[PDB]
Point group: D2
Chain length 152, copies 4
């Protein structure tokens, strides 16, 4: 359904989504440039977005993925993930990664449903990389769950 295409021009409407995932606009711009940003449109409305950054050799990661609140929960999330996997294949990558907070129960499900498997956990991650205490779904988000998926 969703029509996804490459992106090169960032505007307030787009930053709104990218900022839903990564609050720090600074860090966003870093990988937004060094990485590939794709935008998904549903007609004329900006549905969602996701960035593919290249990390370790032969390894690529989804450094950011988001869907407009008024349009999420409709299945666009899964479409983007499954799509990022395809862009990653044509990129010749061997393994694709992505990670979120231990509190993000929903995502922990979604990603796995798209083939991702949990690799390891970066303990105290959010504790040392953030000033305040992040909370979500009655859980203290303080660990970075790392997931991966081999393409072969």
């Amino acid at each position: 359904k969703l029509r996804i295409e490459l992106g090169e021009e960032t505007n307030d409407e787009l930053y709104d989504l990218l900022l839903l995932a990564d609050p720090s606009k600074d860090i966003v711009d870093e990988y937004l440039e060094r990485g590939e940003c794709y935008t998904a449109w549903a007609g004329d409305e900006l549905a969602g977005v996701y960035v593919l950054l290249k990390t370790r050799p032969q390894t690529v990661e989804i450094v950011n993925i988001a869907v407009k609140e008024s349009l999420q929960k409709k299945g666009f999330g899964k479409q983007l993930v499954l799509d990022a996997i395809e862009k990653a294949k044509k990129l010749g990558a061997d393994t694709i990664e992505i990670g979120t907070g231990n509190s993000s129960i929903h995502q922990l499900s979604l990603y796995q449903k798209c083939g991702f498997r949990i690799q390891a956990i970066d303990h105290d991650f959010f504790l040392r990389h953030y000033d305040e205490d992040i909370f979500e779904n009655g859980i203290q988000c303080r660990d970075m769950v790392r997931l991966y998926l081999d393409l072969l």
Copy 2:
């Protein structure tokens, strides 16, 4: 609410619950003996059950926990977990553990809500310890998520 008390007598009604979690009745009997089995009643009806087995030094694990299907989703799950943590405290244990399949999204939430933090993952676990392919919530259950919780 739920009234939990020690258990020493196993009967079909009880095995029904223990088998909800661990299918293998053999393995169950092993830790059922070497471990402490508690039963929770809601009046005269057998609500749920859970076993506390001692693993590493100063470490105890919830090798099994279940709640009657016709009574689960009412909050008894959380009560048992929170209760097992108390039995574990009086047992002088330093850390308490518990782990489930990566597909068990619901549990991954519950346990964390009771303080548990994800430790590490036992990759391909269910692949080598089971013959068939376990599936749940549209996810291929094949990894053993290990969680823990220090008591101090």
Copy 3:
């Protein structure tokens, strides 16, 4: 070479070894009882010792292993490890574990040489379970390296 046999009687000479690995005599006694303690003699002299404790279901761990300083570095270490693996086999265990501090470079080698593979890391472990700062080989020992080895 080393002659290893079951043990049931603890004496100062034996505690000296067990305490080389685990300083806390209290914790030692715990698993010393609940676990199986084997002693290795080289003639009439107490060469070394090791304890096999049963942790998770079908899983056994070497909660302690040591060799008299005046006799270590002669290869008795490896013999005990390889021996504990055999006792573990006859015990019908599926997997055997053992872990040490990230600073224990020597052991990280030894164990792997006996088939052990690194599983996961318990970050900050020694930080929360000990009062002082442990140091060894110019490394700040603060992480618990968990290793395992399937028996099949």
Copy 4:
């Protein structure tokens, strides 16, 4: 002691070092370009070399480091690592990574001595990414030990 400076010209003498670490010349060229390659000279002789590749956002990794065999073991190894950490700081990175095979006991020590801490293990890594069986120090190298180090 060692004089380290940026590099842009690759010659047989340099590839000799880079290939000591990563045999695959192909993969080397990939990160050799997308990454920053520094060379360390001890007078007029090419002492060693190391490459800083940028992986995850705010994260940089030492994708390759080596020292001329006839000059290693003199402490140049440590100098390069400690130097890569400084180049990484001025690069504004938050965390720096580096990983080697579980068999590389020597490095497991070196890196830790430079502040690196073991993060997680990529099981069966070398089994699926290499055709032959790698061996070293009487150990079957088949796991990728991942280390990291926060810069703040």
